[PDB]
Coordinates of C-alpha atoms in Angstrom, one line a residue:
Chain P
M1 CA 130.4 110.9 130.0
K2 CA 129.9 111.9 134.1
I3 CA 129.7 115.0 135.4
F4 CA 129.4 115.8 139.2
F5 CA 126.5 118.3 140.2
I6 CA 126.7 120.2 143.5
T7 CA 123.3 121.0 144.7
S8 CA 120.6 120.3 147.4
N9 CA 118.0 121.0 144.5
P10 CA 116.2 117.6 143.8
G11 CA 114.1 119.9 140.9
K12 CA 117.2 121.2 139.8
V13 CA 118.4 117.8 139.8
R14 CA 115.9 115.9 137.8
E15 CA 115.7 118.6 135.2
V16 CA 119.6 118.6 134.4
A17 CA 120.3 115.0 134.8
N18 CA 117.2 113.5 132.8
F19 CA 118.1 116.3 130.0
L20 CA 121.8 115.5 129.5
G21 CA 121.1 112.1 130.5
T22 CA 119.1 111.2 126.6
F23 CA 122.6 112.4 125.0
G24 CA 124.6 109.0 127.4
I25 CA 125.7 111.5 130.0
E26 CA 125.6 110.5 133.4
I27 CA 124.7 113.7 136.3
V28 CA 126.3 113.1 139.9
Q29 CA 124.4 114.6 142.9
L30 CA 126.9 115.7 145.2
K31 CA 125.9 117.4 148.1
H32 CA 128.6 119.7 149.1
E33 CA 127.7 123.1 150.7
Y34 CA 129.5 126.4 149.3
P35 CA 128.5 130.0 149.5
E36 CA 126.6 131.8 147.2
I37 CA 127.7 136.3 147.2
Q38 CA 125.1 138.4 147.5
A39 CA 125.5 140.0 143.7
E40 CA 123.6 142.2 141.0
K41 CA 123.8 138.7 138.3
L42 CA 123.7 135.2 138.5
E43 CA 127.0 134.5 137.2
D44 CA 128.8 136.3 139.7
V45 CA 127.6 134.3 142.2
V46 CA 128.8 130.8 139.9
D47 CA 131.7 132.3 139.4
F48 CA 132.5 132.6 143.6
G49 CA 131.2 129.2 143.7
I50 CA 133.5 127.1 141.6
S51 CA 136.2 129.0 142.2
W52 CA 135.6 128.0 146.5
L53 CA 134.9 124.3 145.4
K54 CA 138.2 124.2 144.0
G55 CA 139.8 120.8 144.5
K56 CA 137.0 120.3 147.1
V57 CA 134.8 117.6 145.0
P58 CA 135.3 115.0 142.4
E59 CA 136.1 116.5 139.0
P60 CA 134.5 117.6 136.1
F61 CA 132.0 119.5 137.9
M62 CA 128.6 121.6 137.5
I63 CA 126.7 124.1 139.9
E64 CA 123.7 126.4 138.9
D65 CA 121.9 129.3 140.1
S66 CA 119.2 130.4 138.6
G67 CA 115.8 133.2 139.7
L68 CA 113.4 134.6 138.8
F69 CA 113.3 138.4 137.5
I70 CA 110.2 140.5 137.9
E71 CA 110.4 143.9 135.8
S72 CA 107.6 146.0 137.8
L73 CA 109.7 145.5 140.8
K74 CA 112.9 145.8 139.2
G75 CA 114.5 142.9 139.1
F76 CA 112.9 141.1 142.5
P77 CA 113.7 138.6 144.0
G78 CA 116.2 137.7 141.4
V79 CA 119.4 136.4 142.8
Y80 CA 117.6 135.7 146.0
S81 CA 114.8 133.8 144.4
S82 CA 115.5 130.6 146.9
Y83 CA 115.2 132.9 149.8
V84 CA 112.3 134.9 148.8
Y85 CA 110.2 132.0 147.8
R86 CA 110.7 130.1 151.4
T87 CA 110.3 133.7 153.2
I88 CA 107.2 135.1 151.8
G89 CA 106.3 132.7 149.0
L90 CA 103.8 132.2 145.8
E91 CA 101.3 134.2 148.0
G92 CA 104.3 136.9 148.7
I93 CA 104.9 137.4 145.2
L94 CA 101.1 137.4 144.2
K95 CA 100.2 140.4 146.6
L96 CA 103.0 142.6 145.7
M97 CA 102.2 142.2 141.9
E98 CA 98.1 142.7 143.0
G99 CA 96.4 145.5 140.5
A100 CA 100.1 145.3 138.5
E101 CA 100.2 146.8 135.0
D102 CA 103.1 145.2 134.3
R103 CA 103.2 141.3 135.0
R104 CA 106.3 140.5 133.0
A105 CA 108.9 138.5 134.4
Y106 CA 111.8 136.6 132.9
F107 CA 113.3 133.2 134.6
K108 CA 117.2 133.0 134.3
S109 CA 119.8 130.1 134.6
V110 CA 123.6 130.3 135.0
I111 CA 125.7 127.0 134.7
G112 CA 129.1 127.0 135.7
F113 CA 131.3 124.2 134.3
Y114 CA 134.9 123.0 135.4
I115 CA 137.4 120.4 133.7
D116 CA 140.9 121.1 133.2
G117 CA 142.6 123.5 135.4
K118 CA 139.5 125.9 133.5
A119 CA 136.1 127.2 134.5
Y120 CA 133.0 128.0 131.4
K121 CA 129.6 129.5 131.8
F122 CA 126.2 128.9 130.0
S123 CA 122.7 130.8 130.4
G124 CA 119.8 130.5 129.5
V125 CA 116.6 133.0 129.7
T126 CA 113.0 132.7 129.4
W127 CA 110.3 135.6 129.2
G128 CA 107.1 135.5 130.6
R129 CA 104.7 136.5 132.8
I130 CA 103.1 136.3 136.8
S131 CA 100.1 134.4 136.6
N132 CA 97.1 135.8 138.7
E133 CA 96.6 132.5 140.7
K134 CA 98.7 129.9 141.1
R135 CA 98.2 126.6 139.1
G136 CA 99.3 123.8 138.7
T137 CA 101.6 120.4 140.4
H138 CA 104.5 119.5 138.8
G139 CA 108.1 121.4 138.9
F140 CA 109.5 123.8 142.0
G141 CA 109.8 127.3 143.4
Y142 CA 107.6 129.8 141.4
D143 CA 106.8 127.4 138.4
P144 CA 103.3 127.6 139.9
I145 CA 103.1 131.2 138.7
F146 CA 105.1 131.6 135.7
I147 CA 103.9 131.7 132.4
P148 CA 106.5 131.8 129.7
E149 CA 105.7 133.5 126.0
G150 CA 104.0 132.0 123.8
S151 CA 102.1 129.3 126.4
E152 CA 99.1 129.4 128.2
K153 CA 100.5 127.2 130.8
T154 CA 102.1 127.8 134.1
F155 CA 105.5 126.0 134.6
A156 CA 104.5 123.4 137.2
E157 CA 101.5 122.6 134.8
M158 CA 104.0 120.8 132.5
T159 CA 106.1 118.0 132.3
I160 CA 109.8 117.7 133.0
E161 CA 110.5 117.5 129.6
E162 CA 107.9 120.0 128.9
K163 CA 109.4 122.2 130.6
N164 CA 112.8 121.7 129.9
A165 CA 112.0 122.4 126.4
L166 CA 110.7 126.1 127.1
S167 CA 112.7 126.8 130.5
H168 CA 115.7 128.8 131.6
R169 CA 117.4 126.2 132.5
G170 CA 116.6 124.0 129.3
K171 CA 118.2 126.8 127.2
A172 CA 121.5 127.0 130.0
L173 CA 121.8 123.2 129.5
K174 CA 121.3 123.4 125.5
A175 CA 123.7 126.4 124.8
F176 CA 126.2 123.7 127.8
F177 CA 125.8 120.7 125.4
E178 CA 126.7 122.4 122.4
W179 CA 130.0 123.2 124.0
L180 CA 129.9 120.0 125.3
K181 CA 129.9 118.0 121.6
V182 CA 132.6 120.6 120.7
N183 CA 134.9 120.3 123.6
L184 CA 135.0 116.6 124.6
Chain A
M1 CA 119.5 135.7 98.4
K2 CA 117.8 139.9 98.3
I3 CA 115.3 140.1 101.4
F4 CA 114.0 144.1 101.7
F5 CA 114.1 145.7 105.2
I6 CA 112.0 148.4 105.8
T7 CA 113.3 151.2 108.2
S8 CA 114.7 154.4 108.2
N9 CA 117.1 153.8 111.0
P10 CA 120.8 154.3 108.5
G11 CA 122.4 152.5 111.7
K12 CA 119.9 149.9 111.9
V13 CA 121.0 149.3 108.4
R14 CA 124.2 149.0 108.1
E15 CA 124.7 146.4 111.1
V16 CA 122.6 144.3 109.0
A17 CA 123.5 144.6 105.6
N18 CA 127.2 144.1 106.7
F19 CA 126.3 140.9 109.1
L20 CA 124.4 139.0 106.3
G21 CA 126.3 140.8 103.3
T22 CA 129.1 138.5 104.0
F23 CA 127.0 135.5 103.7
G24 CA 126.1 136.5 100.3
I25 CA 122.7 138.5 101.1
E26 CA 122.0 141.6 100.0
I27 CA 119.6 143.5 102.4
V28 CA 117.9 146.2 100.1
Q29 CA 116.4 149.2 102.8
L30 CA 113.3 150.1 101.6
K31 CA 111.5 153.5 103.5
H32 CA 108.0 152.4 103.9
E33 CA 106.4 153.4 107.2
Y34 CA 104.6 151.3 108.9
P35 CA 102.7 151.5 112.5
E36 CA 103.9 150.5 115.5
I37 CA 101.8 149.6 118.4
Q38 CA 102.2 150.6 122.4
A39 CA 102.6 147.1 123.7
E40 CA 104.4 145.4 126.8
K41 CA 106.8 143.6 124.8
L42 CA 108.5 144.0 121.4
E43 CA 107.7 141.1 119.5
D44 CA 103.9 142.5 120.1
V45 CA 105.0 145.6 117.8
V46 CA 107.2 144.0 115.2
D47 CA 103.6 140.9 114.8
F48 CA 101.8 143.6 114.3
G49 CA 103.7 145.5 111.7
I50 CA 104.1 142.4 109.1
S51 CA 100.9 142.4 109.2
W52 CA 100.2 145.7 108.4
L53 CA 102.7 146.0 105.4
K54 CA 101.0 142.4 104.2
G55 CA 101.0 143.0 100.5
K56 CA 102.4 146.8 100.2
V57 CA 105.9 146.4 100.0
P58 CA 107.8 143.7 98.0
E59 CA 108.4 140.3 99.5
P60 CA 110.3 138.3 101.0
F61 CA 111.1 141.2 103.7
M62 CA 111.9 142.2 107.2
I63 CA 111.6 144.8 110.0
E64 CA 113.1 145.1 113.5
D65 CA 112.4 146.6 116.5
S66 CA 115.0 147.1 119.6
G67 CA 115.3 148.6 122.9
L68 CA 117.0 149.1 125.9
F69 CA 115.7 148.4 129.5
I70 CA 116.4 149.6 132.3
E71 CA 116.3 147.3 135.5
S72 CA 116.1 149.7 138.3
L73 CA 113.8 152.0 136.4
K74 CA 111.4 149.0 135.8
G75 CA 112.2 148.6 131.9
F76 CA 112.4 152.0 131.0
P77 CA 112.2 153.5 127.9
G78 CA 111.6 149.9 126.9
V79 CA 109.7 150.0 124.1
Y80 CA 110.1 153.3 123.7
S81 CA 113.9 153.8 123.6
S82 CA 113.6 155.7 119.8
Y83 CA 111.5 158.5 121.4
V84 CA 113.0 158.7 124.8
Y85 CA 116.5 158.9 122.7
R86 CA 115.2 162.3 121.0
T87 CA 113.2 163.8 123.8
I88 CA 115.5 163.2 126.8
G89 CA 118.9 161.9 125.2
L90 CA 121.1 160.5 126.4
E91 CA 121.5 163.1 130.0
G92 CA 118.0 162.4 130.3
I93 CA 119.1 158.8 130.5
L94 CA 122.5 159.6 132.7
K95 CA 120.2 162.5 135.2
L96 CA 117.8 159.6 135.7
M97 CA 120.5 156.9 136.9
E98 CA 122.8 159.2 139.1
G99 CA 123.1 157.9 142.5
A100 CA 121.9 154.3 141.3
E101 CA 122.9 151.6 143.2
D102 CA 121.8 149.1 140.5
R103 CA 123.2 150.5 136.7
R104 CA 122.2 147.4 135.0
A105 CA 120.2 146.8 131.8
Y106 CA 119.8 145.0 129.0
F107 CA 119.3 145.6 124.9
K108 CA 117.2 143.6 123.0
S109 CA 116.4 143.3 119.0
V110 CA 113.5 141.7 117.5
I111 CA 113.4 140.5 114.0
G112 CA 110.3 140.0 111.9
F113 CA 110.4 138.1 108.5
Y114 CA 107.9 137.5 105.7
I115 CA 108.0 135.0 103.2
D116 CA 105.4 132.7 101.9
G117 CA 102.4 133.8 103.9
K118 CA 104.4 133.2 106.5
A119 CA 106.1 135.2 109.4
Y120 CA 108.8 134.0 111.9
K121 CA 110.5 136.0 114.5
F122 CA 114.5 136.3 115.9
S123 CA 115.4 138.2 118.6
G124 CA 118.8 138.7 120.7
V125 CA 119.6 140.1 123.8
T126 CA 122.8 141.5 125.7
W127 CA 122.9 142.3 128.5
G128 CA 125.0 145.0 130.5
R129 CA 125.4 148.7 132.8
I130 CA 124.6 152.1 131.8
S131 CA 127.6 153.8 132.3
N132 CA 128.5 157.1 134.2
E133 CA 129.5 159.3 131.4
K134 CA 128.6 159.2 127.6
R135 CA 131.9 157.3 125.8
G136 CA 132.9 156.8 121.8
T137 CA 131.7 158.1 118.2
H138 CA 130.5 155.1 116.6
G139 CA 126.8 154.1 116.1
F140 CA 124.1 155.0 117.2
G141 CA 121.6 156.0 120.1
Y142 CA 122.4 154.7 123.2
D143 CA 125.8 153.3 122.3
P144 CA 128.0 155.7 123.9
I145 CA 126.0 154.8 127.3
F146 CA 125.8 151.1 127.5
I147 CA 128.5 148.7 128.6
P148 CA 127.5 144.9 127.5
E149 CA 128.6 142.1 130.1
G150 CA 132.0 140.8 129.8
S151 CA 133.7 144.1 127.9
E152 CA 135.5 147.7 129.4
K153 CA 134.1 149.6 126.2
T154 CA 130.6 151.1 125.5
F155 CA 128.6 149.9 122.3
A156 CA 130.2 153.6 120.8
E157 CA 133.8 152.6 121.2
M158 CA 132.9 149.6 118.8
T159 CA 133.2 149.3 115.5
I160 CA 130.0 147.8 112.9
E161 CA 132.0 144.2 112.8
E162 CA 133.0 145.0 116.7
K163 CA 129.2 145.7 117.9
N164 CA 127.3 142.9 115.9
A165 CA 129.9 140.2 117.4
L166 CA 128.3 141.4 120.6
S167 CA 125.0 143.2 120.1
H168 CA 121.5 142.2 120.8
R169 CA 120.8 142.9 117.0
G170 CA 123.8 140.5 115.9
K171 CA 122.6 138.0 117.8
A172 CA 119.1 138.0 116.4
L173 CA 120.8 138.6 113.3
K174 CA 122.2 135.1 114.2
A175 CA 119.3 133.2 115.1
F176 CA 117.5 134.5 111.9
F177 CA 120.8 133.3 109.6
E178 CA 120.5 129.8 111.0
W179 CA 117.3 129.2 110.2
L180 CA 117.3 130.8 106.6
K181 CA 120.4 128.0 105.9
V182 CA 118.1 125.8 107.3
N183 CA 114.9 126.7 105.4
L184 CA 115.9 128.3 102.3

């Protein structure tokens, strides 16, 4: 089955296509820019996005929003993870986190899927901590400073299959795949 | 199958017994006090607890820790939810949350299970927001000031079966039940 994934993030592209790939699902990366609202929650942004790509994109379609939520920083950068990454970078988070007693954080991914006059949401969350220094050469964004719970390596020290086994995006994709086999 | 649940929380007792009940699992509430460490994470407390109830309690056994983590309060009261509830109460949280732009919070439950020279952990999380006033007559603890995402009612406006369908504890119990059918 084919799914059109509206995104300009190539790191997301690969994670999604490869995972859903090995069950025979072809993921097709369309680049149609859509509006991401400011909101307290990722799902709010996804809802708005699907509603807007109504009848401008081939169906079935999916979109995704994700973020790193840092406990001692009251959820920052959260919904604005992409912006904060490109402005202040990995060094900015590490500077903010210097001397922190609490380095806990989570990644959250929310997938929106549209098919048959209807939208469905799936989500995934991985808990962890912010590393004391950047490590690793894979992945994208905050991957080099996030170590998920139970692991010693950062997200960026792992391969796509390895991240997908542990990551927020992997879990939302799982929840999504579970719904798909039950509804198609 | 019988499971010995070491706890003095009768609200937890009922939720757990009833849910696992309807699949023919008899949950037995033993009261053996054990030590809960201060820790950044619920799972840390559970691990320590199981390790300590080693060979003092009949097997198989389970224990649970849970907490309400309030975003704008940097995860408070979190691991210390039970203490904070009995000291400052529902009124204390509401006072702390007055004028808050961000009322987001989550409940997390972690179940520890011991059987066959081995411990296993399961967890569940429900996202939501702190209500502006207390509502409802069911449940325990912060139930009257927590509204889970997608709902209009607080945890305390719902029945046990209704909370179990939506709650953190219900989700950990589900994850636990899924593991049980696969391993017994």
